[PDB]
């Protein structure tokens with residue numbers, strides 16, 4: 001597989017190797033704020049990251065993943081629309097070449113500069129590989145980034161990117177606190193969807209926070225200096241690694257707030 005984000009291997013091509021690309025519950029989507037309905041029975045959302053153990057950061061030639069030790073319930077997401085316990089395995093971002101694009105979800109067609117995905121798997125399925133095969137296997141917490149003031153809790157990420165410039169590079173990344181990437185409010189929208197990269201599996205309960213976080217232009221500029229290519233290959237800047245909005249089809253987006 002040689003998928004990517006260019007003209008020749010980008011989102012419009014994915015359906016040929018991954019037919020589920022045209023499925024009934026694909027992500028991302030546009031969130032129409034005037035059609036999403038407040039759901040008074042959503043239970044409170046619970047982000048328990050106090051014991052989180054980050055291990056490593058990896059440039060995978062599409063984005064960078066910050067990886068966590070998920071061998072026990074150290075950093076978990078529960079509540080909201082979720083039944084049971086979901087374990088944090090990694091986070092990554094999607095971003096643009098320009099500040100007016102980059103996010104995957106959109107809000108009344110508004111694109112943010114970037115979008116953070118904290119990826120969690122349902123522990124009743126035992127491992128991540130089994131979880132991606134289930135309709136309720138993953139919960140992804142989505143957070144929009146806008147360009148404004150710097151996010152202090154992000155700077156440790158920005159500063160290690162020099163060391164993982166090219167595809168296949170990784171670096172030790174211990175003692176990173178993902179609580180520093182959260183906005184004040186946990187108000188959210190939720191809907192059933194999919195992974196937004198191949199294999200595009202329809203296994204995600206999406207929880208997208210309404211409140212974006214602000215990051216500085218300098219911070220996002222450093223994302224844009226990463227490379228999709230491997231070391232010693234011709235340089236392709238890692239920008240515009242976002243899949244555009246997919247048909248909502250027979251789904252409802254629910255709001256946690258009035």
Ligand SMILES: C/C(=C\C(=O)O)c1ccc(Cl)cc1
Pocket residue numbers: 117119132194195196197198199
């Ligand atoms: C987590 C993810 C994709 C995404 O973030 O859309 C992913 C990527 C490859 C495999 Cl094999 C499984 C999951």
Ligand SMILES: [Zn+2]
Pocket residue numbers: 092093094117196
């Ligand atoms: Zn993502």
